[PDB]
Write a protein that binds this ligand. Structure first.
Ligand SMILES: [K+]
Ligand SMILES: [K+]
Ligand SMILES: [K+]
Ligand SMILES: [Mg+2]
Ligand SMILES: [Mg+2]
Ligand SMILES: [Mg+2]
Ligand SMILES: [Mg+2]
Ligand SMILES: [Mg+2]
Ligand SMILES: [Mg+2]
Ligand SMILES: [Mg+2]
Ligand SMILES: [Mg+2]
Ligand SMILES: [Mg+2]
Ligand SMILES: [Mg+2]
Ligand SMILES: [Mg+2]
Lengths: 128, 190, 232, 160, 50, 467, 110, 75, 53
RNA sequence: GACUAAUUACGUGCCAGCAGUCGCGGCAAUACGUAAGAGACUAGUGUUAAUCAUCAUAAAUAGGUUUAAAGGGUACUCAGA
RNA sequence: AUAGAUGAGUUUGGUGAUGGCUCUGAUUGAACACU
């Protein structure tokens, strides 16, 4: 562009990129509380295979999102208050959130030894 | 002294003209390693194309490149070619290049800048190897267009061979190009 | 690197305190940096305090350690100079790679090189700690006898320290003429005078006096220095 | 105007790229000012005002140019001798900085910074071999000739 | 540019630089080619200038 | 001499033209071009003050490796000095006479600087070279002649003497050619300047442009001695030679050359003219009757005082140093400004352009000077009123350090014979090979043997005729 | 030993063999060539502008360069008789002398 | 870093000789020619102790040498 | 002081080593920028009228 | 697992699960879970969210549009350059 | 203020480009999990 074209305002902001977790990025929040509208299973896409434990959560802001339940085995069900954070399930379409394991109603993996802080597991205290 | 257990440095010992013990004292480094493939009537044929550099650390650098079905053989071909393609690289005070240089190799532009003493090798990983092998200690580099591993080494090596020669620039213009830092301290302070 | 032996430290103390020679002369004589000569005197003065106050010296520790370190003996045997007293600091401006185009037959000197680096830069001829050595070496070039060349060197160093000692005297005086000491029943109030108008054209002057306005506490910033930086 | 200096810079690049021993330029005081500085800096070999045909090569300095009047001012041209040393042109690159669309002016402290190889303003630091020509009230000068005389002005072009 | 890079005019400059120092740093350089001193004072002539 | 000391000694005096000399600078070449073609590039104080500072300055450079001096037009390189102006000043009392003595002061400081220059110096004698033009050339190791070259020293015609270093170059030329060229003021043209020895090379005027563009390419090493540098330039000039004329023969050679050695070997101009009459006489075995008669008709026209002074310096200059020569000539020239012949010869020939008849010297002829008379010592005695000439440097020598780049002369052929035991034909090939096919060696060496060599041992070998 | 390469190449028809001249450029070998009006002068170090299609001009140029070599060989062998060698041992043979004395030095102790 | 300046050199030379030639001083013959000549060329004028590298890389951890606890351990 | 020093430099004489080393440029080209009217503009205009007719 | 400093054994068998990017898991998995070891930071450590820089990735400094995003169907023209 | 300018993974049978994405650096009036 020429100096005249720039002076008239040719330079504009690049088109925005969609966030990984829009429900949290839109309002600058790190996490949000919500009630489980449904707790079921989602199927990955072409390459991977299995059953991914997901939950349809109604955030405190009114949005209904699908969150992934990390870990082996969970305790939440219909009408369960859980905390939601960012991060998505890469192979699951529409699952753009995770549930916190040490959340209100969702419990941490009991028989967890490695990476306990990721799954809200208290230390076994077997030594004491 | 039984150092060459495979007779690989026998031909290189004739071209260059240095003992096998002196050849092993060079600073070699495998910079680039590509897995190229060619489609033939008999199916794919995957090769290992590698680039190797060789230098003394005191103003000599050589670039070798070869491919082979075996990754080990390609590294030896490139090493022999790198040790025989060594060339003297001019250095300012045996620590940096003369002025600024910009070389282009097929959409890969490299810009090398001379820096004062104590500046260090604030350059990318592959340029750090070439400078640390040729004997350079103070340099600044910048890729402008493309970061192709192969063309970044070819453009960097070609830039070190096309530095502005102050002795020629002076005779061309009919004017001295006085080394201010040399007159200031009464000699070259390496 | 070697260390000044116990005998050498004493020799330095006598030439500067008893013989009254200038520090620059003792530095140039024994090839000891003026910063080290000034330190050997301060450390020796502290020994005289201990010896006077009857404090026991760490003599067992001193002897056993001095044997482990290389030493230079100032005096009869002049084997090598203790250190280089003419090391100049490499200024940032003098580190740049400059190739100035000039006529084919110009006499480009160190004065011209200093200006090629900057308008305010000085040649190494003026950055020496004992700059009288240059004028001393120029005398030898003029076939001046050594005994006379040494005389001019002492008078040159002895005269330079007179100006330095005179500047410091007038300096400290101006620092006291600006202080009004009012003695009260408990303390002594010191009223230092200053020009409250020297705050810069925008009020942002590094040397301005007063707690600056429009700035919060930096107590929550990383790398914040909260310990004394100068024990004066 | 500045457009003529911009044409003089690109033309000399093309004449040196073609390894021509001679080259002509339109006869203007502005082109003559820059040519005298290039000759004064040692980038060109000669400057001579002449007609549409180059003067005799051998007797170039002793050439007798006729007076320039309104009867021939339209055919006058400045003939420049180009240098080539070590199989390389001495005037390889002539990159303009101030253009018809924008006239870039530098201060004395910016030229002092660009002379030692540090960027300042829209200019960049000079490296080994590069030169910079500034159009000042004292004539077209080299950046190191300008800082010596302590003046700024319009930046014309950077000669590699 | 299909043509190749001919550096025939710079054989002396290139050969004299390669012979200045030794590849084995810390040793004196070997004897140079026998032709280096022959054309020491016979530089090439300027070419390609129109 | 410092840079400022030179700029202060050669200040531009009022009346100096700004472009009497054109100075060019190329890669390794520094050029000086005299630019007064209308006046045949005649030297004067204006242009001498522009050349001396440059030569002193280029001498402080390591990038100026070859110095070339030349003329502007196609007719002259440098046709004498501004002697016509000196004759006018001399007629303005002693105040005007010193102005002339100060001119020769500058002119000699320059010739001494050229003779003792510490860089290769080349002169393109592409035109008439007389007077001042001779001083800028003869003292150089390389002196290139062309078909346009015309050498002569017409000083005795104007009641003067060979002034610019001629008291050092002519006395030590092969045979008595020095005194002959100085006294008779003979005029050599083209290749004859190259066979005589005044020029070291012979090229064509059209090859000089290409030679300069090549001299500029020669980049020596800083550690090369002056000898190696002169050898590189000597081999470069011999590449642009297109051969000497195929029909033009050596002018001063054979009979004429032998006559010069017999007639110009005395120390009295009266005896020299007496010997010439013997050659011009009928039956003289020399066979140069036509030549002897012509030279006689010339000497009678030259100033009789100049002949005595000239013949005297040719015998003394043979033992003088080059620095001591320019100082003595500065004293001699001072005496000529006061003399009557110089002011008369110049005013009658140059200012009047031959009008008012010929000149009228102090004595009407040589017969007026009696045998016992000695009109030379007066000129060879320093004058305390004239300060000694202060040269730009303290260098000097008794013989040119590098003056063996021309053709071989009697000295070279003699050394080769007294050293080796060559033969007639073998000796000629010794020089044709030693000089690497330099044009004119076979003709020159052949001539030297025709005069100063005889078969003392028969066809076996050849020795000199002396003994 | 590594085979020998020429220290100088005199090509009488550069236009027809650029493979030879390009290997001399890579090997840093000076070259002389007869450059005709259609030949590229950048292929050789020293050009001889002349007609390369005439066997009469090629014989003259070649004969003149042959006399040059002959005249140079005569001086080299004349200086040798006086005990003056105009060259130094090449690097190839130079290294052999070093390791040769080493084998003698090894047996020196043993 | 610092550089050592010999007063004897600065008293006899003003640094002009360092800018001879084409700006970087006169050229010396290559190493394969010096020893060949039995006569060694005159010593080139320059400040003594030049053309020796400075170990800047070895000063990476110099700031630590200024702490009080470290200085006590170095004493 | 800052003004006098800066004005002095802008009007200082060139360096002597720069004068005795720089090549010559004929003043006929380096200073003759003025272009006057053709002195023969009237004679030529009268001859051009005759030829055009 | 690689980017990214740091390994084996067993269990599981495209399941359970890991995953910032590329990916891993289909019965002899250094990528999942456990065990031990190793590499790191430490009264903090990870994760989520955000900002700058990376990004000459809206280029005034400083980009680009034959074939990859991008030359208006056309050039006479007011403003403007 | 003169030291201050750096990359890495990932499209292809393969190669060179184009062009996003992610990681590498610093940080928060942060929140959460394990402490
Ligand atoms: K890209
Ligand atoms: K002429
Ligand atoms: K992939
Ligand atoms: Mg994916
Ligand atoms: Mg563990
Ligand atoms: Mg042909
Ligand atoms: Mg790893
Ligand atoms: Mg994990
Ligand atoms: Mg695991
Ligand atoms: Mg803490
Ligand atoms: Mg279209
Ligand atoms: Mg439309
Ligand atoms: Mg359309
Ligand atoms: Mg395809």
């Amino acid at each position: 562009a020429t100096l005249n074209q720039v002076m008239r305002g040719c330079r504009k902001p690049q088109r925005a990129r969609h966030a990984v977790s829009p429900a949290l990025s839109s309002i600058k929040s790190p996490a949000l509380k919500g009630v489980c509208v449904k707790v079921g299973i989602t199927r990955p896409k072409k390459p991977n295979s299995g059953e991914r434990k997901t939950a349809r959560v109604r955030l405190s802001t009114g949005k209904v999102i699908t969150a992934y339940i990390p870990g082996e085995g969970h305790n939440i069900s219909q009408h369960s208050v859980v905390l939601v954070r960012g991060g998505r399930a890469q192979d699951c379409p529409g699952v753009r959130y995770h549930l916190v394991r040490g959340a209100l109603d969702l419990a941490g993996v009991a028989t967890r030894m490695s990476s306990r802080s990721k799954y809200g597991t208290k230390k076994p205290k077997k030594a004491s | 002294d039984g150092l060459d257990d495979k007779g690989q440095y026998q031909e290189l010992k004739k071209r260059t003209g240095m003992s096998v013990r002196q050849i092993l004292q060079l600073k070699t480094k495998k910079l680039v390693h590509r897995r190229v493939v060619n489609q033939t009537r008999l199916g794919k044929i995957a090769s290992d194309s590698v680039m190797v550099i060789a230098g003394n650390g005191d103003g000599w650098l050589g670039l070798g490149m070869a491919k082979s079905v075996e990754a080990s053989i390609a590294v030896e071909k490139a090493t022999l070619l790198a040790i025989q393609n060594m060339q003297p690289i001019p250095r300012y005070e045996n620590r940096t290049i003369y002025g600024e240089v910009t070389t282009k190799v097929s959409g890969t532009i490299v810009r090398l800048n001379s820096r004062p003493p104590g500046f260090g090798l604030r350059v990318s990983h592959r340029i750090f190897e070439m400078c640390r092998a040729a004997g350079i200690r103070d340099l600044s580099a910048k890729f402008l267009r493309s970061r192709n591993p192969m063309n970044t080494v070819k453009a960097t090596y070609q830039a070190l061979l096309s530095q502005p020669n102050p002795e020629d620039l002076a005779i061309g213009r009919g004017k001295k190009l006085v080394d201010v830092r040399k007159v200031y301290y009464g000699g070259s302070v390496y | 690197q070697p260390v000044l032996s116990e005998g050498s430290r004493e020799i330095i103390y006598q030439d500067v305190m008893e013989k009254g020679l200038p520090i620059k002369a003792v530095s140039a004589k024994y090839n000891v940096d003026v910063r080290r000569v000034a330190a050997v005197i301060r450390l020796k003065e502290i020994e005289k305090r201990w010896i006077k106050e009857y404090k026991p010296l760490a003599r067992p520790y001193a002897r056993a350690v001095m044997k482990m370190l290389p030493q230079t003996v100032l005096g009869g045997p002049d084997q090598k100079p203790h250190e280089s007293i003419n090391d100049v600091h490499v200024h940032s401006y003098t580190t740049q790679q400059l190739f100035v185009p000039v006529s084919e037959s110009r006499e480009f000197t160190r004065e011209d090189a200093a200006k090629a680096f900057g308008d305010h830069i000085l040649p190494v001829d003026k950055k020496l700690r004992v700059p009288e050595l240059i004028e001393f070496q120029k005398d030898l070039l003029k076939e001046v006898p050594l005994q006379e060349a040494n005389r001019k060197f002492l008078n040159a160093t002895a005269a330079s320290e007179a100006k330095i000692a005179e500047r410091e005297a007038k300096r400290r005086q101006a620092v006291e003429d600006a202080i009004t000491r009012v003695k009260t029943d408990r303390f002594e109030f010191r009223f230092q005078e200053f020009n409250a108008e020297n705050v810069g054209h925008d009020g942002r002057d590094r040397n301005a006096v007063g707690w600056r306005y429009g700035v919060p506490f930096p107590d929550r910033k990383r790398s914040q220095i909260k310990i004394p930086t100068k024990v004066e | 105007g500045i457009q003529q200096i911009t044409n003089m810079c690109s033309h000399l690049q093309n004449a040196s790229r073609a390894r021509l021993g001679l080259t002509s330029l339109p006869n203007t005081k502005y082109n003559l000012a820059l040519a005298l500085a290039l000759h004064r800096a040692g980038f060109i070999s000669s400057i001579t005002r002449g007609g549409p045909h180059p003067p005799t090569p051998e007797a170039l300095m002793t050439y007798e140019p006729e007076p320039v009047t309104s009867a021939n001012v339209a055919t006058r041209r400045l003939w420049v001798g180009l240098k080539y040393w070590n199989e390389e042109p001495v005037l390889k690159e002539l990159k303009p900085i101030s253009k018809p669309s924008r006239l870039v002016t530098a201060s004395l402290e910016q030229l002092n910074r660009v002379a030692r190889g540090f960027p300042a303003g829209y200019m960049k630091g000079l490296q080994l071999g590069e030169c910079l020509f500034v159009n000042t009230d004292r004539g077209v000068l080299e950046v190191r000739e300008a800082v010596e005389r302590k003046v700024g002005g319009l930046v014309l072009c950077k000669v590699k | 540019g299909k043509g190749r890079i001919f550096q025939a005019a710079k054989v002396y400059q290139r050969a004299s630089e390669a012979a200045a120092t030794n590849i084995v740093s810390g040793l004196p350089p070997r004897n140079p080619p026998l032709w280096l001193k022959a054309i020491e004072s016979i530089p090439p002539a300027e070419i390609n200038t129109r | 001499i410092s840079t400022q000391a030179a700029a202060e000694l050669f200040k531009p005096v009022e009346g100096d033209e700004p472009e009497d000399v054109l100075f060019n600078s190329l890669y390794n070449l520094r050029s000086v071009e005299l630019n007064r073609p209308a006046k045949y590039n005649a030297l004067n104080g204006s242009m001498i003050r522009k050349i001396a500072p440059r030569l002193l300055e280029w001498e402080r450079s390591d990038m100026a490796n070859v110095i070339v001096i030349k003329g502007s037009g196609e007719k002259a390189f440098c046709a004498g000095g501004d002697v016509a102006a000196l004759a006018k000043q001399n007629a303005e009392g002693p105040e005007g006479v010193k102005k002339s003595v100060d001119y020769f002061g500058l002119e000699y400081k320059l010739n001494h600087l050229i003779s003792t220059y510490t860089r290769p110096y080349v002169a393109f004698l592409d035109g008439i070279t007389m007077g001042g033009g001779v001083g800028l050339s003869i003292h150089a190791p390389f002196r290139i002649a062309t078909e346009r070259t015309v050498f002569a020293m017409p000083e005795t015609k104007i009641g003067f003497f060979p002034d610019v270093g001629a008291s050092f170059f002519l006395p030590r030329m092969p045979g008595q050619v020095g005194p002959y060229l100085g006294l008779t003021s003979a005029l050599l043209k083209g290749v004859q300047v190259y066979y005589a020895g005044i020029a070291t090379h012979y090229l064509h005027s059209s090859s000089l442009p290409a030679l300069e563009s090549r001299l500029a390419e020669l980049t020596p090493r800083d550690y090369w001695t002056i000898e190696q540098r002169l050898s590189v330039i000597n081999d470069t000039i011999e590449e642009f030679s297109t051969g000497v004329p195929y029909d033009e023969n050596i002018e001063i050679g054979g009979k004429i050359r032998l006559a010069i050695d017999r007639c110009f070997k005395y120390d009295k101009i009266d005896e020299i003219i007496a010997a010439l009459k013997e050659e011009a006489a009928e039956g003289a075995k020399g066979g140069v009757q036509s030549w002897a008669k012509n030279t006689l008709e010339e000497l009678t026209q030259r100033s009789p005082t100049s002949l005595h002074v000239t013949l005297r310096q040719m015998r003394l200059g043979k033992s003088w140093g080059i620095a001591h020569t320019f100082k003595r000539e500065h004293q001699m020239a001072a005496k000529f400004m006061k003399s009557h012949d110089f002011n008369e010869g110049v005013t009658a020939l140059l200012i009047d352009k031959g009008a008012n008849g010929p000149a009228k010297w102090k004595p009407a002829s040589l017969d007026e000077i009696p045998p016992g008379a000695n009109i030379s010592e007066d000129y060879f005695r320093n004058d305390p009123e004239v300060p000694v000439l202060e040269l730009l440097n303290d260098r000097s020598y008794m013989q040119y350090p590098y003056n063996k780049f021309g053709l071989p002369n009697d000295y070279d052929v003699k050394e080769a014979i007294e050293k080796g035991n060559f033969t007639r034909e073998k000796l000629i090939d010794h020089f044709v090979e030693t000089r690497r096919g330099k044009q004119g060696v076979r003709e020159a060496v052949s001539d030297v043997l025709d005069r100063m060599a005889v078969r003392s041992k028969g066809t076996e070998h050849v020795q000199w005729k002396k003994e | 030993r590594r085979p020998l390469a020429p220290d100088l190449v005199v090509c009488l028809n550069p236009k027809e063999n650029m493979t030879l001249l390009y290997e001399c450029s890579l090997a840093k070998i000076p070259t002389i060539g007869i450059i005709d009006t259609n030949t590229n002068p950048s292929w050789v170090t020293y050009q001889i502008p002349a007609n390369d299609d005439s066997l009469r001009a090629t014989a003259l140029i070649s004969g003149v360069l042959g006399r040059a070599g002959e005249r140079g060989q005569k001086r080299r062998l004349e200086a040798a008789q006086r005990g003056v060698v105009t060259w130094k041992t090449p690097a190839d043979v130079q290294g052999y002398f070093e390791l040769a004395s080493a084998r003698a030095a090894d047996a020196r102790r043993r | 870093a610092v550089v050592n300046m010999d007063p004897a050199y600065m008293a006899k030379y003003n640094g002009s000789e360092q800018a001879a030639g084409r700006g970087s001083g006169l050229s010396e013959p290559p190493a394969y020619e010096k020893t060949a000549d039995e006569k060694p060329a005159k010593q080139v004028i320059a400040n003594p102790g030049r053309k020796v590298p400075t170990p800047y890389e070895q000063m990476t951890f110099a700031p630590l040498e200024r702490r009080l606890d470290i200085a006590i351990f170095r004493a | 002081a800052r003004y006098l020093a800066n004005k002095r430099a802008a009007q200082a004489p060139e360096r002597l080593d720069e004068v005795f080393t720089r090549a010559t440029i004929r003043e006929s080209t380096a200073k003759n920028t003025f272009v006057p009217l053709d002195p023969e503009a009237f004679v030529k205009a009268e001859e051009a009228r005759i030829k055009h007719a």
